[model samples]
Target chain A: YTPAAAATGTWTEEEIRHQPRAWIRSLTNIDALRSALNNFLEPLLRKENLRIILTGAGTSAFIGDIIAPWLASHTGKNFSAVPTTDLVTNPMDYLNPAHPLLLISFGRSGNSPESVAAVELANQFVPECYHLPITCNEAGALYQNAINSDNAFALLMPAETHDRGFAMTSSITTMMASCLAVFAPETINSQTFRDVADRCQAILTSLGDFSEGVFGYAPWKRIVYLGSGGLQGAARESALKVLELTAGKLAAFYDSPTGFRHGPKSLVDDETLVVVFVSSHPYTRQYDLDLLAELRRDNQAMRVIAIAAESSDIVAAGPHIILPPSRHFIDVEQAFCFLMYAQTFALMQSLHMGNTPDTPGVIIHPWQA
Target chain B: NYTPAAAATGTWTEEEIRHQPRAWIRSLTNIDALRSALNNFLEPLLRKENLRIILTGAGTSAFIGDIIAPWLASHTGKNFSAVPTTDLVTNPMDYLNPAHPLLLISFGRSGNSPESVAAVELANQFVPECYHLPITCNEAGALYQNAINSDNAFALLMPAETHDRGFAMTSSITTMMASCLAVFAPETINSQTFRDVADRCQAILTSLGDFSEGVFGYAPWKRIVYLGSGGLQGAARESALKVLELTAGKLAAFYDSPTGFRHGPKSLVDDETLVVVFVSSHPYTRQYDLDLLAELRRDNQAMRVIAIAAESSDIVAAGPHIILPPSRHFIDVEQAFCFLMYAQTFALMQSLHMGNTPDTPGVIIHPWQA
Candidate 1:
């Protein structure tokens, strides 16, 4: 792995490739925290009207976006995904003082002001509020707050999953896997984790050749990612990965496969690369295939590709990357597999644009303690 | 007063943009006619403690719900969720609250889109006690027809002329949005309030002109970013789409809440980019809006940073801003109407400057089937 890291020549590429290992490690870490998490969350889960808000900022915020819908569907509970940035800026708009609140905060560093302020604001506003800080850094403010507060519990990911790269590759995938493991443990098990990790590892190994073949020659000015339901959240993160990794050299955008046709589809042109994350569910996959077919039929974009786990006529028709078929894996699980392609492509594109994936040199906002 | 060449080229787009103020006034009056019946229908549903209000539409129409959900939630102290019809149509289980009673407020221009109809049907099927409020511009559209026939549905149709003939939604968006504000939160707006907004909008139309050079100056910008906080973020989304649609994809546009921009989206800003913030009227929210505005200007990454704000002491102190007419007690929802007028004019001007007919830059057929 050290020699492999040397060959890749950047922390970003190494982090992207090691995500499979990170996911497995993070799942094991979650196992250690399960008894305490279950004790705190079991009673709250039974509350009829408890409002569970999944929040974080930037790449971390997207973890909730991907999993909230899945958790809600499985548990039939009230779950909402709001960004810490939005919650911190206007707490009144997002926080309801009337309902009992459970805020699941996702932070890579556990130190962003908005990340900490969002927890404090929820405590200040909601009378019967509890905090769950899922973070990477134990030394960061959020983890410290969680440890000190009686109503809070912090789930820290494995140290290696704490990405040192400018973009969040391993950190995001690990944090997201942690949330899924804690909330929907029954749906996912060791085998599921291993299967997804193995699938992603295969993509990681071949990513260099695949990305070179597709994106090597053409420098697409605009990149758009489309998905449905929780995958839309993944698409949002995928789009941000390219934008952040490339230091904004390549413009990136995200939308639901159905919503893209509304007005956002106008942004598609000959210079654009449109990638659709096809759904695994039979019902939802139809809409994904329709848009994939339509974009190809329009012939407006420079290239349109579909990332699918299952085979379909539309998937067979277009330029696509097929993951091994998994009848058991849902869209949220499929998203981890879909995300590897985006992360590798973003890293490749960043290098192609002469930007440092390890340190993109983007300015960081000053935070107050 | 319109030139013959301008009239020949972009008549529908120009007239649709210009007639917004009148359409708003007419829509308010139309809402007034149904005010008594509307109150009678909604009051019972409001009394239900667990009832959820889902504001929905497709494309620009969908934005109406997003822009108003937070404001309405804060004002009414009721739960308001803005879910797009496109989203609901594809994944009904994710959005639809099956056990809880729901008030599904559907917004549409033509109201005939497949997703619009399917969304209502899905809500009816999935939710046990779902009531509907279809706010739309066309009476002949399917949403209106279905609502009129159903017992649990109350449809509010805007003025006939507000069914905009242009490719993009202009008056249709404003009128439908204003109608929802009038219907849902009656106390927030009244005859005087409507008159004030209309007058202010009329002033904006005059100030921006048919082809304002201020907007044309942005022709060189490759990327345009719109930022706002809370409900105004929804307005930002609409603003960004308006530019993309009017320019026929020649110019790329993006939108985010001001604070959200700092996270990763700020990467899109460059020397050829134009950034606009729809400043909040609330003093507390305005602070965050202004902070980002100031930061953008300081970074010097964008070609220009424009503030669309209602005149206030802090806004005046901040720097140069496009000032809207002063309204002492207007909330962000009311201010959004005026702000949208400016955005519509900007989109139209950019369309003309880019050599595309503002009326029909590119043909987009809506109401797509699943």
Candidate 2:
């Protein structure tokens, strides 16, 4: 396969470059997808007995983290993002059979035993339950199970988004984008996706210019990625990407901008690089900027940078990436943009360390036959 | 500040960790006065056909709910979930439903954090049919004060000494967790259980204090990971953060469920890492915990892997361990308290070894109040 200027024919690089196009094509079933999300949410919105659970494992689980908070804040609805394993092992702890449940499951391969077991446990415990399986692989167990099950509809993602990378990058973002499009239809439809895809394309074109200094800088033994609200979930995925690609060469952690001050800030040292994904909401942005400024003032890290929207505050306290604004950009949108920069940095760091991006030194999959 | 033969004397670190067993009974003492009101408030809510109960706090306080929720889920019939006020402040709609009748139980030491208060207000404004139960140590804090004046609120504040003076939470966490247990499962918190749990804690304190110091003194670990399943998962998270916070971030720490660790987070382990697993009390969950512990030990990727368990636990056969006195029955919730004490002692010993005053941390963290 032909590779680009920065490509090394690694599965990760191809997957990273393919995300923008994949997202553009993923704008399928716009109306049908919106129907399922809204239909499941309608009864609950009208004061009925219902609850929505977004669940998955690992990166799949982090997808719920990014969206659950943003969706809850704006919709005034009960949205819980739980790991599938939490439900499988402790169903009574996380699942309430007393209420009619709507389980929104996000999976890449969609076959992890925990995610499958979670759906089964919910079905067994809750007599009245509906399943929304959003998976990249249609043949995976999650898709197969949901397609045949009663009261379950499988919302298949872009086939190409079933990322073959050692770690999830494109697969996660697409699943994240699809969830947003369904729940936040009014804000994330074709028109909005077009705007986001254009912005992503712009970043892809200039990919070599961005994130080079970050992974290329002095060897960073530890990395801390911080964000507030929905962005924090993106920060989580970013931290995992670095840790996974480097095969534990760099220790990484993710926390909310405010939560970091509660003690996690001590992880910052002269050898650590800290990345803060700035928020779009004016009020939340204030908290994000406050921490950004605080980390700079502390001056303990090797480097600190802010990922902010162009329309927002200048964030003059530290070095930052002022992305082109799309006027309607929210936390989910900003998460998509910042995640690209992060995924690219992980790729660059992997190659710079002389490790193949496709296969890191170690591969651990939770789902085994 | 005074120094002990085992630690830096003046910092109150050892005293605070040693004081937890007293705090356990002290928290139980408040239940007598609170029984009528707490039972009355929680009874109808617990009896509801579809009710929501959330356990909330910031930072270390948030882990109280994390530890208690799983234990409550397994032991009690009531619907219980722990959501951090930090998460609630950022995503109120996601966790709360306006249609569902709900009780928001706020756990805090000072109860003055902005997010904690904002969360209460947000629940009121959005979920109109919501009640507040602020369980805090400081009676004058915003959380307690907010609940007292509200018609649909009940405030349960713990005794004064439970309000810890050290940088990390030693007594505060155990008290908040026990109080919740007393409120929800009053039957389980009877004289027999308390006396038994108290005895267990005393035995652990005597056996593990010097053992913890020796572990910290074993080698200067660069990374620490706390692992467990079910209720022990929350205990593990708290222990992981305690070490990271107390050391002033000198050591990197991480936490995950035993089964969840194999997913990817196990990558954090290295030759300089130490992994501690709080073995579960239940036989079923204990198997998963043991299996993962065995895998980590077999991989031998970490510098050290230690298992902490009740003396009668099957895990004792797995490998080298720190075993506490076996209780008559496996009280997972009570075990949460005992395991926390051990972790706090470890952090204290490490903090002293680093020569930083435990009371005055090298760094200060933000609670929701700030």
Candidate 3:
């Protein structure tokens, strides 16, 4: 649904609201994507020489940050989330000549110079490397390049998910969902996938009031995002979203909860907003809670918000959004639900500052030349 | 070495910075002691094929592990990983397994940070059969004291003077890392190699004045980005942190792998930014490093771009460069040490330029405190 006024309409708003439908459309093609990926992944999974790298650039890079640690622990495969930017530069550091590799490239437009360069660099370096391109744009260089390669199979998301907004919204979520379906089909079945989108739709509609209300209260110019493990990537991506959508008006920083104390905690101040993504893993939640409690106790920041799944013993007392709970939702799945909050808030903050969300202050496109 | 007027006023910061060459030689001289300590702990573990080595610490201390992991893995032919102690404390479930025997090598100057001590306990708690290598500069610190009278751990204390009195670590970081190289690959490290490194470091030290002044004299930059590949990436991170700490947020700094910068962090760069690249020495890895330097030159968005390399060739020719003499063909690890001096000194000068004392830059921060 489009906003009532055309001039008042922001492409970012349209794209943000379109995420649930975009993910569902991507889910429809899951059977086909799985079949194609099975060929490369099956033999490698059975053998001892398997290594999977979830890779990309910018927001795309954080996609791996959000999923790789969980995928590595569950599958017991040597799965690593290395970025295309890191892979392309020092291919030797990440890629070994003898180890068979499944290089999963996550791209929004997939035309960024580094995205394409990473694929070619991996091919040139690794003796056995297969490419799986999960992207939104069919005309992107990544799609065309992967489709032509004998060792590659490209999976396309919903066509409209190719976000025209300065920052990625639908494209990021759809690509993230596609990765989940391809890598862990057992965990993310078609039913579970559709239900996740429903959860996303519910939250997307409800967040407008909260985000708009918060923007009216303060002129916050700095943001610190803290998370642990897979959620850390969510923090990084969320931090970057505000930085991008506001065109550097807000200085955003991200780090793991425990790591933040070593030195980066100093970045927080009275004018800064601290957003912490509380983890779902009971084992990891201890550290997350400790930091959240410490932040609240210090009370140095303008505000603190916790994005958590249900209120725990500690989360019950904090100022937070206790999200819809799921008995079977793992870390990566929870990430998709929580990310809607961050994307919506960034959009609201951008609009409140009198800037066009469709094209932020920076003229640089998401698909950089 | 002359003036008492300069001597009386000199801070431990400057003395520590200048003592790097001697401290490195001191580390080389202590190789016999390190050899006796490491092999006694590592041999049976290596033979049983039950060994996994993890290098860990917090902040700059963590960078030592990053700089040395690849080199140690190649030398020892064993599974070697670098994890930050901060990571270990939070997510022990992902990194630790009770089934495999493990060796935890913890690097710390003071060795008393709550996280570093907690990491040692976590590594011991999670792994049933765990050995510890606590390499530290302070003999009185908890890590060093913990290693004593413990069968599972061995402590390697660096030269006494390495425990720096300055806000930033210069001698202490170099000495501890140098000892790791000497211990892991003692055969490759000797008097000849030691003198070669010392000679090159001496030369780099002598040449620092002009290069550092030039970097400081450029247009006032509010942002700095440091890029390097492999072992040098650790040095880049350390360099980035030094700027942030010394300037006290007046100039924010970031670091990434050379190729990784193109991803999204490139947004941080603009007219008021300074970029520094630490070029590698290996023939193959050097190509990738060179490609990035060439790309950065073409983009040309920063206030200035500088490349620090051992020799001038196709890649080094593209920009404002600081060429180090190819005295003895220093490896990437050694190159990291030499490059640190340049980056560290530039930060020192920049800190002074911003009207902050290098001895104590941040009002809210202490060198050894959390």
Candidate 4:
């Protein structure tokens, strides 16, 4: 997001023009990715011989937590997401001797120390631990060592997904999307994804500018994101992006729409920024609306912002940033547009604060140690 | 410079006699002062239709919550849990439920914080109702404010014993754990509070200065293990968090008790670590205790070690720094308080040798969200 020429230091519609508008932006070759994955993973995932642990340190860990639940509900396979940090710190408590293991690691920079240490520890501690490393860098150590082993598989995403910006956006979402391509339940018809992809592609192409305008708002000191249902992890990732992008400076947090009412609503003070990541599914969106109405009624000084795929009905209380409506509730990829918009919101906030989004604080280690 | 006055000699090294002649040395303390307030203040809380949970913390609050969740269930004949912000963020289904009417009880020395506040908010948004019982010494914290006027919210204050003297939580953990005893099922219990709490507190306080001196002198350790069970979750977690938060992640950390440790967690013990064990209340939890002590005693070397217990069972291996366990089990607050002193001693040692500020690690700043 670029500051406008006339404005002293604020974003405007004109500066967001360069953002690309692509149509039918669905996977170029889902069948091909699926076939390749089948050839690669059918032996490991199909046979049920190995206990698979999907892991990473932080956001990467969320990917596992989110995906595992879906796999359980669909495939009914026993799966869990254990943070590598937790695994490395308390390996025995998390890893069991009874299960022959498969460890899958996800990383944006295939280089975080825990990411590498977990790999080495698996090799040393568990006799049957095999590895599946999904990273953005192929030459990186995580991928480098996976080259020859039949038990190991390393898949690299597009280089552009390795974001130059401090926070992960394109790559993190892409990696998760990749899992959807390979690991989605076999019971579902291909038409489900095909249709979901077509509808989201149309929405993202039409609404590229909506998210850009959200960047034009006043700088927020705190952000509280709300989501519900299957999209809870997405809300967590949204909150995480802002926290990491600002290096935890802004005191950002997340909660589910209904869960927010329990006690978290107090966090929305006058200076706070309330972000509602509205889910399209009505039952889920109903809870989202409940929080929205309550926040509006409380009449606090906080700025209430909503990023909905499309409005169910016109509302007059506050700023409801709308995106193009999606064709189906199952087309969650449409959420990417909303997540990407929030990323831009955070990036602009970082720039407004005059800090480098590229090198956020927590990612920086004072020394090698 | 801080060394224990002298080891208190008792009949057995294997365990503390719960009702022994000198047992009041580990009692809850000052029974007479609060006896009147207890009958009037505590009964209705136990009888109330609603529920409250303790969310104590250590090692940055993660470990405290981990142990407490299972602990409150068995001991109080009710449920209390510590929900770590780190874990909660990843999986809300595992921790919070919107249907449960909630009382957000927080254990922290600092009243103002992000995770602490986020936790309160999550309960509010996600659950049907919420009340916060912040066991804090800091009077002005957001937690202590009694956020809402309804019975839905309340705040319990510990004795001025808090407002800790060091970065770690010796007085703070003990103070809060004791406060829980005064609040929950308060209307019930036969133990002599004053004698038991005071004896345990003083014994552990005496051990702190020396425990700090000895633990800090170890060559250098990369990991630390703090162990506990049942009511000690609050103390156990705070002890682990103290080292990690104070050291600013210079040393990785973990926590578990004798029972939980057996399930593959034993991988933690190696040559480069220190393990602090908080012993139990009765023969019920004793099996796990004696088994670990016997093992570590004969095991390979480590950088150093300390066990803050009322009376440890280990006879084969010896150390001078073990704090006397508060000889009270029906009430875990005494031992919880004891860990406070041990943690403080360790925090002091960690800061002194590392050349870091005991008051503030250089890496942190306060009030990030405007």
Best by DockQ: 1
- Candidate 4 lDDT over residue span A1-369, tens digit each: 221232212222221221221111213334546667567677766644456778876567667755655554345444556666555543444455544677888887787665776777677667766787878777676787777566677777665555455466655666666655556634222445544444434443444534343446565556777765445667766767676656545655566665454334444556678778776655445556766877777777368777776665423358677765545554245455556566666665665567665665011111112
TM-score of chain B of each: 0.92, 0.91, 0.91, 0.70
Q: Which of 1 and 4 is the better model by lDDT? A: 1
The DockQ for candidate 2, computed on C-alphas, is 0.36
What is candidate 2's lDDT per residue for B114-134, written digit by digit as tens?
Answer: 877888887787776898888
Candidate 3 lDDT, tens digit per residue, B77-151? 566778888777767656766677898999989988777787888888889999888889999998999988699
Q: Which should have the higher DockQ, number 1 or number 2?
A: 1
For residues B1-370, could you state the per-residue lDDT of candidate 1 as single tens digits?
1111233334698788777777788788877887789899999999999999999998999899888887788778898988998888777878887878999999988989888898899899889999999998888999999999999999988899889899899989988888888887778776557788888777776776545574436547899998888788899999999999999988899999988998889989999998888888876777778777778877878887788888645543465468786656567888888888777778888888768887778112233233
TM-score, candidate number 4: 0.52
Candidate 1: stretches off by over 4 Å = A1-6, A208-217, A361-369, B1-10, B214-219, B312-320, B362-370
> Which ten contiguous residues of candidate 1 chain A have the minimum total lDDT?
A360-369
Best by lDDT: 1
Q: Which lDDT tens digits does candidate 3 get at residues A1-369? A: 232222337778778788887777787787756666687668767866666888887788888888776676666666667777666545666766666778889888988876787788778767888888888889999998998899888888889889998788888888888888777888886678877877777776566544454324477757878887778888888888887777666777788888777656656768878888887876676778888888888888898887787587667665688776556567788888767887877887777788887887111112222
TM agreement with the true structure for every prediction: 0.94, 0.90, 0.86, 0.52
The sequence of per-residue lDDT tens digits that candidate 1 reaches over residues A1-369 is 121343548887778777888888888777777798899899998999899999998899898888897788788898889999888777888899888999999988887888888898888889999988889888998999888899998888888777788788888998888888888888765557888887777666665444473344475899999999889999999999889988888899999988998878989999999999988877788888888888989989998988888777889897888876544678888889889888878887877777787987112232232
Candidate that beats the other on TM-score, 3 or 4, i.e. the better one: 3
Query: Model 2 — interface RMS deviation?
Result: 5.4
> Of the candidates numbered 3 and 4, which has the greater lDDT value?
3
Off by over 4 Å in 2: A1-6, A29-47, A73-77, A209-216, A311-314, A361-369, B1-8, B41-51, B70-79, B90-102, B121-130, B209-212, B215-217, B311-318, B362-370
